[PDB]
Design a protein around this ligand. Structure first.
Ligand SMILES: Nc1ncnc2c1ncn2[C@@H]1O[C@H](C[C@@H](N)CC[C@H](N)C(=O)O)[C@@H](O)[C@H]1O
Ligand SMILES: [Zn+2]
Lengths: 321, 57
């Protein structure tokens, strides 16, 4: 089956990898292709769309055509008795095209309603290529905003936002009832996103006041998880006990402090590899290049995000091999 | 501290199995007690349902 994933422009690398990681965990991918903000997946298996953070829309594709073949596909595409509408993304004269296509549907007995449709016909127009299908899923953007880190009862500055935190938990490929570990959990950004998706969250932090505040944040969101006082350098956990690791490392504040995080990177690299299950993943956020510390891992993804102009984030997806 | 947590929890030092010495408990979690290793014999306190499993550095 063909699905179009209309991706968020934030980071296309994360957006694409997020879909592909969940698709390989939930089902079976025959093939895929990328074209700017469009990701086409030939897919079978269980739907995972409600979990996606960097995908705005998911459409089940009926046909791919040129602008001139568009009226003919709208003469063939199945019609239903429930209220429908046509939504066009790309090009100019979008509203006029939606009205024109809606009239083609009506000709075959469709009930077109713009106010309360149950079915949405989707047309994506990119470089004289039209992707036609039915809306399967649309992400509620309001949900991440309502979970903004400044809205939690225990607040700390520089928290990872819900959208990036959810994308990173998804990149580990962790499923419902499996364990996701955040060994430098802070206010619990990663723990919250994991818990909301049905994953069992485990948080570790070496400051007592922080583990207490984090536990209050979990209570606040109604999440069942464990928050322990410990050091990420010496994990109080058995070998091969966790499916995924998602974490934000301490950032270097000054170039004068170069090498001070070397021990933390070396110890956690060995500890993450020990504690992860076979083929397990760690999605990590740093502000320095750490390739040399994680040579023991397969680096599946490396992306960058400049945040202040003083801060450039490095985002890695590491796989145990 | 949830009891089901002992299934994946290990000593932060030697990574051996831990034993819980319950002082105060609840229907769903351990409130007060100690965590003792079966190899190192290293002790770790549990206060207000929080185990302090930080190394003794
Ligand atoms: N070795 C460690 N073990 C456990 N928690 C740690 C460790 N180092 C730092 N933390 C905690 O990690 C949290 C902050 C980090 N996630 C990094 C946030 C942010 N990138 C920064 O540079 O501050 C704090 O709550 C720290 O107490
Ligand atoms: Zn021990």
């Amino acid at each position: 089956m063909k699905f179009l994933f209309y991706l968020s422009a934030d980071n296309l690398e994360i957006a694409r990898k997020e879909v592909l990681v969940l698709a390989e965990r939930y089902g079976w991918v025959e093939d895929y292709q990328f074209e700017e903000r469009l990701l086409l997946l030939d897919y079978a298996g269980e739907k995972f769309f409600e979990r996606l953070a960097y995908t705005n829309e998911v459409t089940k594709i009926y046909d791919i055509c040129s602008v001139s073949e568009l009226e003919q596909v709208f003469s063939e595409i199945p019609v239903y008795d429930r209220l429908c509408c046509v939504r066009v993304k790309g090009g100019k004269g979008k509203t006029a095209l939606e009205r024109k296509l809606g009239a083609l549907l009506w000709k075959r007995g469709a009930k077109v309603s713009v106010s309360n449709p149950e079915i949405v016909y989707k047309v994506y127009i990119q470089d004289d290529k039209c992707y036609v299908g039915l809306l399967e899923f649309e992400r509620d953007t309001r949900q991440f905003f309502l979970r903004r880190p400044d809205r939690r009862p225990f607040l700390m500055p520089s928290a990872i936002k819900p959208k990036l935190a959810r994308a990173l938990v998804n990149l580990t490929g962790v499923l419902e009832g499996e364990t996701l570990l955040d060994p430098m959990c802070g206010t619990g950004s990663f723990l919250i996103e994991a818990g909301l998706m049905g994953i069992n969250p485990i948080g570790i932090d070496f400051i007592e006041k922080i583990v207490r505040g984090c536990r209050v944040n979990l209570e606040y969101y109604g999440i069942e998880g464990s928050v322990l006082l410990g050091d990420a350098k010496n994990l109080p956990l058995r070998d091969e006990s966790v499916r995924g690791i998602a974490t934000d490392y301490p950032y270097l504040r000054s170039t004068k402090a170069a090498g001070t995080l070397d021990e933390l990177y070396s110890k956690t690299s060995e500890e993450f590899e020990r504690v992860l299950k076979k083929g397990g993943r760690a999605a990590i956020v740093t502000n320095i290049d750490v390739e040399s510390f994680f040579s023991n891992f397969e680096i599946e993804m490396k992306t960058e995000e400049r945040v202040h102009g003083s801060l450039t984030r490095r985002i890695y997806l590491l796989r145990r091999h | 501290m949830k009891r089901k947590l002992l299934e994946i929890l290990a000593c932060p030092l030697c990574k051996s199995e831990l034993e819980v010495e319950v002082v105060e408990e609840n229907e769903e979690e351990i409130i007060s007690g100690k965590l003792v290793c079966s190899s190192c014999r290293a002790e770790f306190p549990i206060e207000d349902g929080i185990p302090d499993l930080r190394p003794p550095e």
